[PDB]
């Protein structure tokens, strides 16, 4: 049946077919918008390929081929023909936005003969070789392998050689040549085989490619980071060319509605004076701002902007937009919802709401819900940024202060990120290729490319500083150093960027906390307001604690009580505790821990205010708590009066081969009922008099981690019961408080109706049930992790987001039995994932009570929480 | 409701209600034999009691005195009365026969007051007193805690005051006297309470203490070893007293209907004149051979005999028989199928299968599956036993070569055989407390105590030696030596135990391998012929192939590839292959290796003699493969041009947390899948040249570790189907052979619909499997899982018996999922669960087209996988 679709035939509602390209390409044409005609094939037919062993089936190819006849036809033009040829561009898409992830291929059907043709049909030859230049350039290194640089310094050295400085400037003769050069390149690539002659293998070559485009390094990057399946597959469109080679009232732009970085209202973008659609949105070349079309172009660029008013209308959101004018005759390519910042996110909501266009329901919606980490991140310090040395100033692409040390690649910026280090990557060319950099680093400056590039579309989205088109840096990249300002900066050397101002700066910048603004507040309303999970908060202190009730959290759910134990005045105590043979003994040294612990719980009480609390007894293995160090070993063996080969055969005595799966947690508290009851009474003494202390009420909740069989938890519940009962008795406190458990290993999870029997609630640790399912741990794993990710055999990080499909069983049905036994239980989820919208969707969706994050993801927790609600 | 029924009220049925000892007493009443008439008061009672929180109900209580009224009226006796009283054994006697891991206790009725009117009654005071001091003895222990180490002293200390050798030759006085100081003993720790002169009130706390019995703690150890439930609980029998302790014509006694250890057929049992049963069962007495009372009073063995004769008959199955003569007359107490040895279960079978009286079928289901441990248990050297030192010698109580050093308590015994020590345990007496020895015992010596003893009828079952009763050894348990015949011995000195003759030996006597009787061989074909089950083997090399195979295994199941790097010549290779610098320094270190274990596999595959195999790839992570100390470290690098710097740099780096969740296994061939090409080459070469040779058929199972993704096991797949169809190229081969994984991740089994999509079979690594269900390993269970069992958090041990409630959940998950999208799906089991009875019934039960276990265990896999065909 129909594999190939005309734009005409489709609209925006058949997104799956034909992508949010050919969706919104046959949505302009439905439109009437002057919008050049082609087709699509659809995202089956990419499919097909993959099926028909990467290859396209008899009866694909001559519905491609049937239809690009169909656009001759219309044009007056045949295809990649000799004299008067037509020319056509191959552009990919998925059914998502992934930009500049995937590649297209311009000016494709000019051949040796059709390039003498169109320079004399248009009288332009400059123009014509341009544009072959152009093909080879670019579908040579898409389409084969043949890397940029080549022909990035092909076109320079020649330049050099000819002494001029732009584009516009190389003869008929050099482009000519170059075109020569460009296929040379090629022939020599790929032993013997010359530059593909017949528009039919050209047209052929380009469609499958770009079905491969799919599966590109760099586009594995961006679907991880947006968790997009890596099944979906993309559309090729297959469009009649426009050019803007072709002189001065002919050239490219691309725009957004309102400005992407700040939210605000009004044409924001660039434009480029003769010149095709690559070199501005490929950060290839540095483009002028978009007054300019408007000032020496007042009427093409009132035309535009009416158009774009309607887009914005039509969609309803603030829109990117690709377009060319080819000798003063505008022409729109693309539009779609730009990649904003959240900053800017939030902005246009707030905007659109107010203006009448959208609900406070659709806003909520639309927000991407991670970007919010990005309003926390710091700022310049005024006074320190005042007084930074300026070396120079570019493109303000993406906001952000960024300090860090410089690298000129990006595998290597990602790995100095991923040591320890804050780096700024330093790059020719703002590019997609680079986005393992971009992602890794505090900031990014390049030395052309402007704010409408792709990179910068996506830095302002990923919430990475941009700073773009800074001509005057030169790469020294045998050496790893660049030039800029007076003097040449080492690989690792400090520089500091702002992409706001758009100044640069040697050395590294203070930076204070930043400010959360007021259109944040508003959208934070409507989510608060929509949501029924409630906001949780991971915190294990006070000071954590009055940060995420600040950011708007409800409580904590879990509380970790490891450092209690820990720290100086602490740690003695228990490693007292551990070397004491007698019962008592341990009682005894654990005891001299109670008004430090208590005194603990109270500055947390105090702190809370009546929100809940899930407190954590004791997770880890003793051996976490011995000296390892000989020094503090003779030290302990003093400090009690033994000799130092007991305290060293009691270390090696708690050693473990697997420290992730020891004598800890649950399975410790019950060998040593003494640590559970100690931190029962310091909790239960401390809520009683902070309750007493402050009129607000307390209900303690009691966790108890690593549990897995139900008369397990039923042994350690019953200690802590009677020591909250005992303390309850003394103080004569009716004190409510629930004894609840971690669901973090499986078994626990798979028999949540015998465990919910004991537990009065139900904590999910997807951490930890993460790694006993899959069977790595956090740690050890990176050593694999990524060679997966470039593989796709894991397209998101177990780690960061809630492996639903496999981890989520085990959450639901621990959910579905537990609650079987006992239908009024509560669940909450405390991992990382507790902070991953698409784990507290998920969250929402299984049927919890609330998911708890990081005091700074709380409110990523919260429009997450909004939008979970909604959807559904 | 009827918590309680008189033994006329009972039969063989009523058996998880009357418990056990109340259906034979119920069921033989009946056949109308000389039972004593008592009273069963139900099972369910045990569970009432139990739920009331271990308090007696008003209708329980009224129960029971009503027939302690009816029993009045038979006996014309009102019970525990002062002048003629009514005097009662309180038995106990699970729905399991739990040999003496439950307590009795004998001559309830008794007082300083009712004492007396007894011997003015039966007229004799030596009698009178010694059961009065019985029931003050039994009754102190089992309701109080008063230990046998006390009042078997002061009956020391009066065996020597008063010069006797026996406890015959005591005057009633001393019985006066011996009565008095237990009181002594028994108020002394009860707070200043004495013993309960309540004929009704004894009564009382006596049930209470025989319900708690349930759980005690030999008893608790003895459900765990035979798979008992451990909410069955006991019920409770009140009974009329006969009396084996009143002269020269009365006395009491047990004998098996069959030689329970050799199966030999005809009666054995001991017996003792005046004394009660508990002399004898409790190993606390030497009791003469049967024969003797064969002499003595004939009208009573020929009375005996012929009842055992037709107690065998009436049960189909060697029969464990209890009697007690009270003056001439016989009295029925007790009977049960008799717990013998593996030899034994297996003779009687047959034997009881010839001579026409259980069917083939029969015969099968009712051997005790994992018995056939102690079948291939090593026969101590003939000639190193001809030169066996021999010191002393008494009851061969149970069979075997025991040999090991000894320990003086159960305790110091188990704790020796934890370390790894071969242990030998040495006691005063055998006694069914001292448990955890004679699970850890290589074998036991004890200075007193029968063959017809509780502790060696325990003994036998599990298969462990027990050499009683040597009169001649005195242990000196302070010193800890015992002087024997020889010398005396020290804590850990190696001796050996013929329990085959009960003779001794000074020395650790060499063993060596044993046969399997004509009588096993038998059986196995019966096995065969019933199980749907087939079984392979947990096998690496030719020599354990062929061992498996030779006892039943069908094929192999599990060729674990480690040793082929483990070993000498091997593992420079992938010590060479580690520190490769390069993809292709790995390729070239690794080719080197595909000689070595490609004879590695045509080994194995003339030893299959087309048996399928099994084919882990390599599971472990490089740091296994590595040298871990620092002096080996430096050797290695002078070979390969490096310094200690370059190796620790590696040795440093590979080093996990947890290397049990490490880069290892299937993820190790994602980024070395040189490996899974290496190894695929060097089984596939070897198969077919063997397949060409011997002219026999071979289809390679290939099996991926550590999958828990399906895209994941496809990847090392792809990898495996180019190099297998390179060499099926190369030799012009058509080799079929199969790509399986093993399902030791929990995420495999969860999404099994998927995984099978991939895998042409599933293989139950069972093992990982449970540490990952359950959250722990098993090289570090040891702290706290003695504990679990103790406190009954955990009933069985996970490593052992298959975790059908918790693990079994996964399994069936996983053949399910699993089939449901590759019906003809072949999945088998490889844990150490694969041995287990238990284990493989479930397995049977849900699917799994086979069982394999080590070589050593495929008796047991086979029989078990018979005996589930059958019972399901
Ligand atoms: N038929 C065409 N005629 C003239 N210019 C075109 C044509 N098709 C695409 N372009 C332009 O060439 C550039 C590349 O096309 P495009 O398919 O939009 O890829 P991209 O913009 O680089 N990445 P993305 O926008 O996310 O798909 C853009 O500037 C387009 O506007
Ligand atoms: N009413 C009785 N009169 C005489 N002897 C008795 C009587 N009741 C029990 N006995 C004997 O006392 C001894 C112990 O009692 P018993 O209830 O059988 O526990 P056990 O044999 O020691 N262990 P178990 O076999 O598991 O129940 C046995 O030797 C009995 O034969």
Redesign the pocket.
């Known amino acids: 049946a129909k594999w190939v679709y005309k734009f005409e035939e489709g609209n925006a509602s058949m997104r799956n077919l034909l992508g949010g ?1 050919g969706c919104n390409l046959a949505e302009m044409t439905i439109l009437g918008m002057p919008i ?1 005609q ?1 087709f699509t094939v659809t995202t089956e037919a990419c499919t097909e390929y993959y099926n028909s062993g990467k290859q396209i089936t008899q009866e694909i190819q001559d519905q491609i081929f049937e239809a690009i006849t169909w656009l001759e036809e219309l044009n007056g033009k045949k295809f990649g023909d000799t004299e008067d040829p037509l020319l056509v ?1 191959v ?3 998925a059914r998502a936005s992934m ?2 992830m995937m590649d ?1 291929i ?1 000016n494709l059907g000019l051949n040796d003969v059709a390039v003498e043709g169109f320079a004399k049909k248009t009288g332009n030859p400059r123009f014509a070789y341009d544009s072959y230049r152009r093909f080879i350039q670019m579908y040579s290194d898409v389409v084969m392998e043949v890397p940029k640089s080549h022909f990035e310094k092909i076109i320079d050295a020649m330049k050099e050689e000819k002494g001029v400085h732009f584009d516009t400037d190389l003869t008929a003769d050099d482009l000519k040549e170059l075109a020569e050069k460009f296929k040379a390149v090629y022939k020599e690539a790929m032993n013997g085989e010359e530059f593909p002659q017949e528009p039919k293998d050209q047209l052929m070559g380009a469609v499958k490619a770009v079905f491969r485009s799919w599966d590109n390094p760099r586009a594995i990057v961006y679907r991880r980071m947006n968790d997009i399946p890596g099944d979906w597959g993309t559309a090729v469109n297959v ?4 050019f803007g080679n072709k002189g001065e009232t002919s050239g ?1 732009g691309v725009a957004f509605t309102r400005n992407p970085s700040t939210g605000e209202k009004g044409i924001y973008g660039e434009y480029l004076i003769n010149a ?3 070199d ?3 950060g290839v070349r540095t483009p002028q701002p978009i007054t300019q079309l408007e000032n020496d172009m007042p009427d093409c660029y009132k035309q535009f902007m009416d158009l774009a008013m309607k887009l914005e209308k039509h969609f309803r959101d603030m829109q990117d937009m ?1 377009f ?1 004018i080819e000798e003063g005759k505008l022409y729109f ?2 539009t779609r919802n730009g990649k904003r910042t959240a900053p800017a996110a939030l902005q246009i909501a707030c905007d659109l709401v107010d203006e009448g266009m959208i609900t406070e329901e659709e806003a909520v919606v639309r927000i991407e819900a991670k970007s919010l980490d990005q309003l926390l991140h710091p700022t310049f310090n005024p006074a320190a940024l005042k007084a930074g040395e300026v070396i120079g100033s570019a493109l303000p692409a993406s906001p952000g202060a960024a300090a860090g040390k410089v690298y000129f690649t990006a595998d290597e910026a990602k790995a100095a990120h991923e040591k320890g280090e804050r780096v700024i990557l330093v790059r020719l060319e703002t590019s997609p290729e680079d986005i393992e950099g971009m992602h890794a680093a505090e900031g990014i400056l390049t030395v052309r490319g402007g704010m409408t590039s ?1 990179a910068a579309v996506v830095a302002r989205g990923m919430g990475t500083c941009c700073v773009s088109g800074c001509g005057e840096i030169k790469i020294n990249e045998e050496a790893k150093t660049f030039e800029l300002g007076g003097h040449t900066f080492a690989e690792g050397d400090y520089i500091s960027l702002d992409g706001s101002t758009g100044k640069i700066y040697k050395g590294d910048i203070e930076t204070q906390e930043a400010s959360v603004s007021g259109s944040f507040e508003r959208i934070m309303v409507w989510a608060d307001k929509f949501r029924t999970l409630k906001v949780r908060t991971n915190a294990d202190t006070p000071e954590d604690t009055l940060n995420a009730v600040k950011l708007g959290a409800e409580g904590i759910g879990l509380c970790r009580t490891e450092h209690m134990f820990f720290e100086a005045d602490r740690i003695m105590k228990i490693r007292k505790m551990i070397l004491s043979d007698s019962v008592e003994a341990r009682e005894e040294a654990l005891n001299e821990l109670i008004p430090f612990q208590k005194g603990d719980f109270k500055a947390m009480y105090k702190a809370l205010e009546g929100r809940p609390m899930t407190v954590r007894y004791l997770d880890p293995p003793l051996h976490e708590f011995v000296p390892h160090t000989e020094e503090e070993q003779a030290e302990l063996a003093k400090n009690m009066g033994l000799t130092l080969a007991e305290v060293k055969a009691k270390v090696d005595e708690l050693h473990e081969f697997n420290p992730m799966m020891g004598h800890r947690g649950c399975r410790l508290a019950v060998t040593y009922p003494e640590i559970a009851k100690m931190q029962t009474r310091a909790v239960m003494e401390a809520a009683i008099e902070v309750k007493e202390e402050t009129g607000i009420d307390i209900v303690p909740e009691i966790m108890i981690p690593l549990v897995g069989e139900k008369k397990e938890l039923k042994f350690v519940k019953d200690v802590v019961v009677e020591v909250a009962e005992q303390v309850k008795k003394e103080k004569g406190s009716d004190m409510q408080y629930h004894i609840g458990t971690m669901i973090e290993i499986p078994r626990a999870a798979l028999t949540a109706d015998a465990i919910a029997e004991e537990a009065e609630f139900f904590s999910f640790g997807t951490n930890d049930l993460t790694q006993m399912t899959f069977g790595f741990s956090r740690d050890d794993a990176g050593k694999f992790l990524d060679s997966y990710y470039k593989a796709k055999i894991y397209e998101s990080d177990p780690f960061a987001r809630l492996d639903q499909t496999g981890v989520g069983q085990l959450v639901e049905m621990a959910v579905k039995k537990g609650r079987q036994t006992r239908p009024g239980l509560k669940c909450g989820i405390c991992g990382e994932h507790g902070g991953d919208p698409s784990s507290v969707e998920f969250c929402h969706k299984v049927g919890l009570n609330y998911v708890s994050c990081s005091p700074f993801r709380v409110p990523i927790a919260r429009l997450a929480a909004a939008q979970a609600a909604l959807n559904n």
Do not use: C, D, I, N
Request: net charge neutral; glycine share 14%; aromatic share 0%.
């Open positions: 390209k050049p082609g561009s552009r990919s898409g930009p500049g297209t311009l469009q009649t060319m426009v490219t095709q659609g690559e501005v949105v490929a690709e060319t390519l693309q792709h």
